[PDB]
Design a protein around this ligand. Sequence first.
Ligand SMILES: *[C@@H]1O[C@H](CO)[C@@H](O)[C@H](O)[C@H]1NC(C)=O
Ligand SMILES: *[C@@H]1O[C@H](CO)[C@@H](O)[C@H](O)[C@H]1NC(C)=O
Ligand SMILES: *[C@@H]1O[C@H](CO)[C@@H](O)[C@H](O)[C@H]1NC(C)=O
Ligand SMILES: *[C@@H]1O[C@H](CO)[C@@H](O)[C@H](O)[C@H]1NC(C)=O
Lengths: 213, 225, 120, 227, 97
Amino acid sequence: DIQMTQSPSSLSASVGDRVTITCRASQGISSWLAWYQQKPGKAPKLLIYDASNLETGVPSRFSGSGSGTDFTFTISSLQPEDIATYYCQQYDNLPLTFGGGTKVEIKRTVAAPSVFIFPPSDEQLKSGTASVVCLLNNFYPREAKVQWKVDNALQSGNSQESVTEQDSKDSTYSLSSTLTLSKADYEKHKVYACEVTHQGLSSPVTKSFNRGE
Amino acid sequence: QVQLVQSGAEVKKPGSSVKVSCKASGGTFSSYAISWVRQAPGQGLEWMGRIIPIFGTANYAQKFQGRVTITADESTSTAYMELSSLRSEDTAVYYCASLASYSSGWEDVFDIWGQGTMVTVSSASTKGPSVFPLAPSSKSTSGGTAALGCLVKDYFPEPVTVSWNSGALTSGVHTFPAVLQSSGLYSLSSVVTVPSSSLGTQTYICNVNHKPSNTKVDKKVEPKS
Amino acid sequence: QVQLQESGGGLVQPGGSLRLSCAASGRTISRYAMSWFRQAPGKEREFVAVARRSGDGAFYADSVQGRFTVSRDDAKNTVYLQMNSLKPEDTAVYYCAIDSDTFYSGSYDYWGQGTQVTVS
Amino acid sequence: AYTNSFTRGVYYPDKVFRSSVLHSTQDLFLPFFSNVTWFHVINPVLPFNDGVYFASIEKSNIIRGWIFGTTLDSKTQSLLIVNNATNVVIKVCEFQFCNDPFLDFRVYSSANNCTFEYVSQPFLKNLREFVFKNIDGYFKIYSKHTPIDLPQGFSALEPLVDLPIGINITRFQTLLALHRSYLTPGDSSSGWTAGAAAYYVGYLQPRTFLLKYNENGTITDAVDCAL
Amino acid sequence: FNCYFPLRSYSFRPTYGVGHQPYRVVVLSFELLHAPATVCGPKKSTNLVKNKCVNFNFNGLKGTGVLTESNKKFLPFQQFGRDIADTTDAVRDPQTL
Ligand SMILES: *[C@@H]1O[C@H](CO)[C@@H](O)[C@H](O)[C@H]1NC(C)=O
Ligand SMILES: *[C@@H]1O[C@H](CO)[C@@H](O)[C@H](O)[C@H]1NC(C)=O
Ligand SMILES: *[C@@H]1O[C@H](CO)[C@@H](O)[C@H](O)[C@H]1NC(C)=O
Ligand SMILES: *[C@@H]1O[C@H](CO)[C@@H](O)[C@H](O)[C@H]1NC(C)=O
């Protein structure tokens, strides 16, 4: 069956910068290939259906070209509202095959995270389960080490993480991790801590709390 | 104008069969076509089938042939899809699409969807969330500001709205995506930031509404010193 | 440890161009992204530039993106940073640092050593 | 207001080079010493007889184009000429036009579903001349520009465009682009303290002219046989 | 009763013979009445030579003679020159001007 790929898998540029991407397919063609603009959980917007062709209502901000097995797709300008993922689609034949995706986002100067930790409460412990959350707020890169340091000792394999997308208002990004434990394991230790280090930060940061207070 | 209306949330046990709907309206029904698509929380798209209700012709993907059927009736002005052999992986947002691209030189690409129906397949049963607040300490303040929040646990099925009740009180509110427990129960997290001049005294209250049953749950967050 | 040090710099006339050199030995250089940092006299540290394996161009800070360029040599552990049309503003102490995390996307500021660059 | 036209208004008839020759040409010409219509732009619909001679004198390009048609309305075919900041746009449209077309808002036409389209280089205290003829199934344009009331000096107009359109043209009007004016066609001739600018309209007649060609093939003098 | 599908899909596939394959076809229609002809078929079909007798055609202008480089300064808009009594003295080259 028809298979396709997109390269590169992600783009990052400042506001107003030029953007271009390419999509490769299994068989050489000169038409019947589409392009899409998609965001996490949102409806795609059609821009190209056939090689270098578009409908009424398609803005002049998008374009595409190519021949054979490789077709390019270019975007004249980028703005923060455009943080999305471009996709290529092909319908020369019925088994429609969809692209691997290319993320597009905004470049910016380094932003230092606002660090904070989230100690447990009594009602939580009465259920038999224990958990603690460590949060990084409004930092640029995709990830920064969020290390659990129970009793000043590093921990691994016992936490859950959640992620946000880039914020179009200021192009920042946030991250957090959630420790999980049982009340017995919770009370086996005495001191809880989380440590944060970051590109824009001056030195490693440690935040902690204790069972005795 | 042309519009599509989809049903509400639907859930069923694994290995069952389910019926879904897509109500079409506007213009002339006979001139429209309907397609069905599935969208997970970040996995790639899946296309189920296609029908032309005016003429009754339909076709399918190899992955879903046999196990899925589409019927659409003009008199009820809605399109239907039949599903069978449901499994946990089907938990996603299910969309119906209109293929107007067959009679004006625009070919074989949709331009209109409905609102989308979230679906879930699990062995759990419907019930409300469990919520617990947290008590940050004064010694834990940072830069003269602190943050409070709540965690939402043990609710099923989705969708779920987690927020603070109303007003500008929502200043500095920030929420993160959901996760699914191995027991079949969903979860969520929320947080709000407050300066020194308003933390504690403002008496913040987090809220949750399990709209599949429209059950509202709220809780208070209190710092300590 | 991941030891790293600079070479070059010194005194040059304003409006000129000069090269700053940084090198390492005894360890693999590919498994980390190599970055640069800055500190004006008595001021806080500030990121400058960084280079990666793929060779898809480079990444720079706001104050240096439109004037400076960076490069690296994975087979010899030598990395370089270019200075063009120096100004009184850029008279500062620079640091050579490793994005000290294996095959990582982000970075962590492990500056190894620094040297002064001044405009006459 | 009327004023006399001097020997101005002659043009090259037939794109044929002639040197040191006096040629007797029988074509549509502006008779010498004819009183011509004089208007101040500091644009009424005027009949388009066998020919029209147009001229303007201004420093801030108030005059910007012309418009023609049989009924000068959407009921039948029509022609439009306009000069943009960098190009001149020509269309035969049959479009419906404004009472006082003003350009700045672009208040020129109410509707356009044109059939013929064309673009070329632009025409550009300064004296401008234009001549329009429709003897055959085409619309002919001549023009000339010189630094500078109509001067008494001589000047021969050179052909500029030969459009292959066979529409009926019987009424015409001029487009104005004063510095300020209303954005709707509900008013006319007001909006700004425009400078001293004016244009003239003269009508051609079937005449016999004796044209004088110099050594380089340029017309330097002419004689009106019936004056 | 029947409520048939007025259209139908060709469903082209290799198993089909030449009579059931996707021929992409274009058909042209032409008009010639009341013609200020704007569309013309023939190309230049041109050749040039100088300093010897040759039958020459220049956008028409059928004639015979010897062609040589001139010194007369034609104006930009002029195409052909005539001597006394309308003898074609010079002609501008359509291609090289
Ligand atoms: C052009 O049309 C108008 C309106 O029908 C008519 O009065 C005029 O005689 C026509 N002119 C010619 C040359 O046919
Ligand atoms: C444009 O409008 C005119 C009426 O002003 C009409 O006669 C004509 O058919 C329309 N279409 C074209 C292509 O001229
Ligand atoms: C013809 O043009 C040349 C060059 O511009 C000029 O010297 C000559 O005087 C012109 N002929 C006449 C009769 O003025
Ligand atoms: C015609 O083409 C030739 C060769 O490119 C060129 O020298 C000449 O100037 C062209 N003439 C015109 C009128 O385009």
